[PDB]
Write a protein that binds this ligand. Structure first.
Ligand SMILES: [Ca+2]
Ligand SMILES: [Ca+2]
Ligand SMILES: [Ca+2]
Ligand SMILES: [Ca+2]
Ligand SMILES: [Ca+2]
Ligand SMILES: [Ca+2]
Lengths: 709, 709
């Protein structure tokens, strides 16, 4: 309980480069503690470190220290004798196999438990420079020792190296080497990849059906027609800066719509609801199977309400701030301002530099959000580590959810919806002319945004994720910080800090939200997600195996707080897809025209048809602007312009007002929303109620194991 | 293992009327087995009974039999010695209080467990006439024995007698005497009564707000106006049998609407969604509290799929049959036919007799449904008793759900909705003129039906429930089947058969469905339910204590399969209330007229107002009927009649077609449905997520008990 003595066997030796044992070689190394003490504060640090070491030795752990070959750095090897391992395996209910005994992962876990009981506070408060377990050997080179298995080498060769991208991951080996948390994360990623493969095959089928039926979409042919669509003049989208544009300029865009706005996309949206339900249920079954196999199950007021309300209010305030930041696209404006202030076509180079600066600002904002969430959680800390982790997960996920989906939601649901008509357009404030929809359409803009986020941004994210730890290691290597032992080699690696796997989970949860919430836009989201995940498994494995210092293995029977998050995203996905199809997409007006507006009562066609849809939906507008300016007159000599709305034509008794067509279309949209939501929710409830939570084989295996034990 | 010997101490004695002990008096009676054997089948029955008795005695139970004072009836008293009780309390993990030992309830439970291990099959197959525990004494008279506590007498005096209706139930005493199932049922009933009191106070507040604001509802004043509402002629509701009726005849009805169709009802519907959420959550908390207090927690393929599909198809077929039976009101028609074939104003007597016959047919149909559900479950029996009970519960609940709510759903959502217009009315088949809405309105009809079901039918149900066991006992008493001992007295009581508490739960679940699903009609449903439950607690207690033979105590940590049923009813209630308000109620058209149809664009009023609503919603109709008959001409000389729809007036370019008003109203209804459903579901999710499942005090109490033990 006192600093009776220092670490015994204080001697230096690094002759063996791949030695995981002590100088004698009988007992292996289960932990390494790195500190520098040779050079008022220094004496206090020395005293505290000596006291901690003496207390640790008093518990039975064997510690011995060696100075670094390259001085003022001291590495203390920590090993647990057999009696200590047995007593703390009796204390901590570890399911050993009963018909070298403990694999190094569980040995390191036990030693870390011992360090925690009497380490994190010391490391944080400059007492210890580092504290970490040891890898077997270099990932690319076999271990010199023959007795010691180089399972890190095999893990790199068959699972982490890109040459083995097609091989299924050795999840048992991953769980054995890194622990249950990493293993369950990678198992979930693989299962997600398989389900994405299924959804991607179905989505490609629907996309191909839409693609083959391309020349037979009448409205696009009318749009591209120089007569039907070439003689339609559209009102300007802004004051004295947008010109009267004919519809022909959207012709190419219209073609893309016939591939992304068709009944195939609706069928695929229904199938995607079903697929999300199946994904959740079969993940529950697989999670139960993993719980059985890996034995992951183990056992170890007014003021509070006011604090909770205050923290929730602060979270809501910062969420609003992030909403304003993203919708206000202030990052791009700031990047442009910085580029202009600071100083092979110049346009593309300037765009690339602006994008790079925007990405840097984005990552800085992300770490700012992390800091804010940490501060808020500390402000309302319940001091329970699991509860603290869940609360921080929820806060950070909300921040990232807003930061990533605010632009998409604005494009889908709030961009161009409230614009009025060219006469008396809506002005929110002194700021004028709330932006209207793009000439191609809001659905096409949303599809383009999703393609950019899922196609290029995912690749750039993977490249940055694979290069950042490598660069951080390379700068240390060039910093000069000849043969090097194992502990020093692992010391010069980037330590995966707290909530390291949290970001890996968060990236995939954001991808899942992109795939499910906005699947009504384009059916190729599952395919892009599939490609990204196939790359992501290997990039995460490679960066964890090589570039990152080994973490203490943990245990977890589930992905954690992400399960309710995914369930909530699944619930929200039905509503979001229904809204996108009804509001963002133009399929409902086309269907209504085909079934109600082309018949004799409201048309001149004897049977249902789609021709004339373009000419019979664009409301006319004579140039009579309210003087509450009238920018149209100065632009050109045009007299009548047609806009995308269902107002009454000029000269009507109630002109520029919603007619029967508008309310019929609105009723159709709302009825579609209600029908789709109710049908999809009923199907999801039936599927969840008709699927066992645990696997059929797992029940029998558990029963047999209980019978035999 | 063989019939070595018969029951020892075979002797007769009934001198002590309230003796729960044997003839000696040292050991009490824990069970009574009643049989008759003194008079080829008889010898086999005798041999089997003797073998069973010998096997039972071999296990250590002490049995002795006495012949009835009034012959051929033999009662065998069964008692368990101390060693047997100890060994089977070690076998069955009973939480005894460790700082006469076993109360008679648990003694009877243990003895019944012993009987089952080596009784139900014997009783079913005529081997034993009966097998039951014993009450302490007569409910109205103190036990003669002083040592024996007459807790049945106290239970009747303070909880079951109607004189103690206002006193809170002694739930601990109920659990001690009857067991955990009965105790938890009564605790749930009491908690339901309290929550109903809260909801009823709020509903009475809303009803009073609607009642005070009665003279200021303009549309009812217009309806009752001899000028505005007296000059409106309505089209007949049927062919050549309904006359042209002026609106004045509905004036009184309109007044009632101003009390049941107002913003107060909407506010109360929102509050009722919130109240259902709070009810479920606080019941979860109370259930956890009871689990702690009473220690209720204890421990003891293609062909199958084809069988499941076949059984589900049969269930669906019978559900459709019950739908047709109830909507077809065949019970009332059959009762009228029977009355006419068989044979102080005659009208009221005939109506009362028809109602009595209808009630008899209803109870016969209920037992038929029970038999059908039993047969289906036996057809697909998984042979697990808990699973069998849950499946039978689901089947019987579905049958009763249909049988009780089909009429209400038809009135609310399918009666008068699809009628077309007087020109070319819709004919489903050769059967003509699908019935239109009542002149008062579908909402008033639904409110009247709910009042009849909740107000009078509940009282009649309570009267029948309290009289049926009493009559069945009285007929046995008059059958002559002088002093009588305890076992004979309890023998002459109606045995509460299998799933006896199932019906008690089912009645309250049906009442809960009536309260929640259709609360948008009238806000007084919680008050009527509160009165009915206040009576129901006492009637159930009285009929269980006095008129029914005592049941073996059981254990259950929850109400059972009824919890998911109530959760599903709660989920469906939001949708049903939204549909009722939007579709069944006329509030949405009134709101639209006040905000959109009374302004200058569609009205002549400078500001928002409700006057002129009646004259500006009833579509006109000139007498021009299709000849696909034209019954209107022969009825009278009227030329133009006004009907409740939004078709175009005659002479319009597209006359008798839905106009902009109809689609505006439909869009308003659907938007209200979407908004209300989403808001209510979000609020329910937030409330469930912000309420701990277990009580705050219960957590600390469990922690303290674990610390001290
Ligand atoms: Ca990545
Ligand atoms: Ca990653
Ligand atoms: Ca399931
Ligand atoms: Ca009753
Ligand atoms: Ca009852
Ligand atoms: Ca809760």
């Amino acid at each position: 309980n006192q600093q009776d003595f220092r670490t015994p066997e204080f001697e230096e030796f690094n002759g063996k480069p791949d030695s995981l044992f002590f100088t004698d070689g009988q007992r292996r190394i289960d932990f390494i503690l790195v500190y520098e003490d040779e050079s008022g504060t220094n004496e206090k640090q020395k005293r505290k470190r000596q006291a901690y070491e003496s207390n640790l030795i008093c518990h039975g752990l064997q510690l011995e220290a060696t100075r670094s070959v390259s001085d003022k750095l001291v590495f203390v090897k920590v090993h647990a004798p057999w009696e200590v391992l047995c007593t703390y395996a009796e204390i901590m209910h570890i399911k050993l196999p009963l018909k070298s005994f403990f694999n190094p992962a569980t040995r390191s876990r036990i030693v870390y438990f011992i360090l925690s009981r009497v380490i994190n506070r010391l490391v944080s408060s400059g007492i210890y420079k580092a504290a970490f377990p040891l890898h077997d050997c270099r990932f690319n080179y076999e271990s010199e020792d023959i007795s010691c298995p180089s399972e890190r080498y095999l893990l790199y060769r068959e699972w982490a190296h890109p040459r083995s991208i097609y091989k299924k991951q050795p999840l048992d080996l991953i769980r054995k080497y890194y622990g249950e948390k990493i293993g369950i994360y990678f198992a979930w990623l693989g299962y997600y990849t398989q389900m994405l493969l299924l959804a991607a095959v179905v989505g490609v089928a629907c996309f191909l059906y839409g693609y083959l039926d391309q020349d037979n979409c009448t409205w696009s042919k009318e749009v591209c027609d120089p007569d039907i669509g070439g003689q339609i003049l559209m009102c300007p989208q802004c004051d004295r800066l947008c010109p009267f544009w004919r519809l022909n300029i959207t012709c190419e865009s219209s073609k893309k719509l016939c591939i992304f706005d068709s009944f195939g996309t609706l069928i695929f949206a229904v199938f995607m609801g079903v697929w999300v339900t199946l994904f959740l249920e079969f993940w529950k079954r697989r999670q139960a199977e993993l719980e059985y196999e890996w034995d992951t199950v183990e056992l170890q007021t007014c003021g509070k309400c006011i604090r909770v309300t205050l923290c929730a209010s602060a979270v809501f305030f910062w969420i609003l701030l992030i909403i304003a930041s993203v919708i206000g696209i202030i990052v791009y404006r700031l990047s442009v301002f910085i580029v202009f202030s600071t100083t092979l076509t110049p346009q593309m180079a300037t765009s690339i530099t602006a994008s790079i600066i925007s990405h840097i600002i984005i990552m800085i904002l992300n770490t700012i959000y992390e800091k804010v969430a940490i501060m808020i959680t500390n402000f309302e800390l319940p001091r329970t580590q699991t509860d603290y982790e869940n609360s921080l997960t929820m806060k950070m996920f909300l921040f990232q959810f807003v930061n990533y989906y605010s632009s998409c939601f604005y494009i889908a649901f709030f961009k161009g919806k409230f614009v009025g008509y060219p006469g008396d357009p809506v002005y929110l404030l002194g700021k004028y002319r709330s932006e209207e929809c793009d000439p191609g359409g809001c659905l096409l803009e949303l599809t383009t945004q999703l393609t950019i986020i899922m196609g290029g941004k995912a690749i750039w994210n993977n490249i940055q994720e694979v290069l950042l730890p490598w660069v951080m290691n390379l700068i240390g290597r060039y910093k000069r910080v000849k043969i090097t032992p194992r502990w020093e080699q692992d010391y010069h690696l980037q330590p995966m800090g707290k909530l390291g796997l949290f970001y890996e989970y968060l990236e995939m949860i954001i991808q899942f939200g992109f795939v499910t919430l906005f699947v009504a836009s384009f059916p190729l989201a599952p395919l892009l997600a599939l490609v990204n995940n196939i790359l992501e498994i290997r990039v995460d494995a490679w960066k964890l195996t090589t570039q990152f210092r080994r973490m203490v293995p943990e245990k977890a029977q589930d992905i954690g707080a992400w399960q309710p998050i995914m369930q909530g995203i699944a619930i929200l996905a039905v509503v979001t897809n229904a809204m996108i199809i009804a509001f963002t997409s133009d399929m409902i007006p086309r269907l209504v025209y085909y079934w109600s507006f082309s018949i004799p009562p409201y048309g001149d066609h004897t049977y249902y048809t789609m021709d004339g849809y373009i000419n019979n939906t664009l409301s006319v507008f004579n140039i009579t602007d309210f003087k509450n300016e009238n920018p149209y007159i100065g632009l050109g000599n045009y007299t009548l312009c047609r806009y995308r709305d269902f107002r009454n034509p000029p000269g009507h008794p109630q002109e520029y007002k919603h007619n029967i067509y508008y309310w019929h279309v609105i009723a159709a949209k709302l009825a579609f929303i209600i029908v789709m939501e109710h049908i999809i929710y009923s199907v999801k409830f039936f599927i969840s109620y008709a699927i066992p939570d645990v696997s059929k084989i797992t029940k029998s295996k558990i029963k047999r194991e209980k019978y035999l034990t």
